[PDB]
Amino acid sequence: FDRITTQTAKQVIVQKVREAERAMVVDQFREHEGEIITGVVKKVNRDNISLDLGNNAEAVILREDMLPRENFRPGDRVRGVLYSVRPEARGAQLFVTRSKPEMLIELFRIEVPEIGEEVIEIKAAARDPGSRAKIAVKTNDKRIDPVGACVGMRGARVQAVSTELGGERIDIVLWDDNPAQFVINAMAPADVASIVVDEDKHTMDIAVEAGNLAQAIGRNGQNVRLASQLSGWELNVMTVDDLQAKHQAEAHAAIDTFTKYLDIDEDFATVLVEEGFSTLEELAYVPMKELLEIEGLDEPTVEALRERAKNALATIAQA
Ligand SMILES: [Mg+2]
């Protein structure tokens, strides 16, 4: 049997008022969630700092939410993004960050009025906190230069953001709907010779012009990493010569895969690839009508090829 609750009139009145007021505080903080707030440093622990926001509001910037070489003294004014509010937490309930990408984004929202007005949209942001960052922007307004608005007059705006982030070097890149073009943009200041897009694997091979290699990679691989993070594509950087050489190796691997797992001769495999059939997946599930465009292949053979291809697919997947 469920329990029957008994309280006093005083208890109930007090409880309902406490809860109504507590919910108001929670709601207000949830309104400013994802925004930059300013706090005063109270205590500087070994793995975090305490912030005063007024009205008994205590916020924390954890170690992993700080910039690498940042040191704070009790009483300092610090800004950061309130990215998580946890009402039922026994410890801290307000979490502030300076290292997450949202910090970079919100700093640009402030510094660039065109972003505040939602005339310019931020489509991606990738950071290596304290060191380097990329941010992608776009506009649907024919009057606006989105990169220029973010850089500002003589770079004053982007420098302002960089200074707040301790000299973090920021590349402002133009968004593009074509992934290859976007990645080319994100790879700056590198000069790309050519890109091969593996759409199935969601990876890109990037050939970089001579002398532009160290830039393309960046120190410690920083630039291609940031470009990978910004675009969401896996990126492989190499020389022009390497890319050509890799292409031949892939062209042979396709034929050999066909010869081995379909048990056909090399001339047969070649014809398949020539007609645009380059993978075991394609052979398996292509409309059988598309395979009839090849002169020399009857309906029985195209049925047998599919069944061999489907078997190879099952074989490989379990291997
Ligand atoms: Mg390739």
Short précis:
It is classed as transcription. With 319 residues, this protein is of the alpha/beta class. It contains twelve helices and eleven strands.
Instruction: Tell me which CATH architecture of the domain at 244-318 applies here.
Output: Orthogonal Bundle
State the CATH class of the domain at 244-318. Mainly Alpha
Strand content: 15-25%
Number of contiguous helices: 12
- Based on CA inertia axes, which overall geometry fits? extended
**What ligand species are in this complex?**
magnesium ion
* Biggest β-sheet: strands ordered side by side in the sheet: 1-2-3-5-4
What is the helix/strand order?
HEEEEEHHEEHHEHEEHHEHHHH
Q: CATH superfamily of the domain at 244-318, called what?
A: 5' to 3' exonuclease, C-terminal subdomain
Structural class category: alpha/beta
Question: Cα distance, first to last residue?
Answer: 57 Å
Give helix % range. Answer: 40-55%
CATH topology of the domain at 244-318: DNA polymerase, domain 1
**What's the alpha carbon Rg, rounded to whole Å?**
29 Å
The description of the largest β-sheet is: 5 strands, mixed, barrel
- DSSP strand tally: 11
PDB class: transcription
Keywords: Transcription factor, Antitermination Termination, Nus proteins, transcription
Assembly: monomeric
Entry title: Structure of E. coli NusA
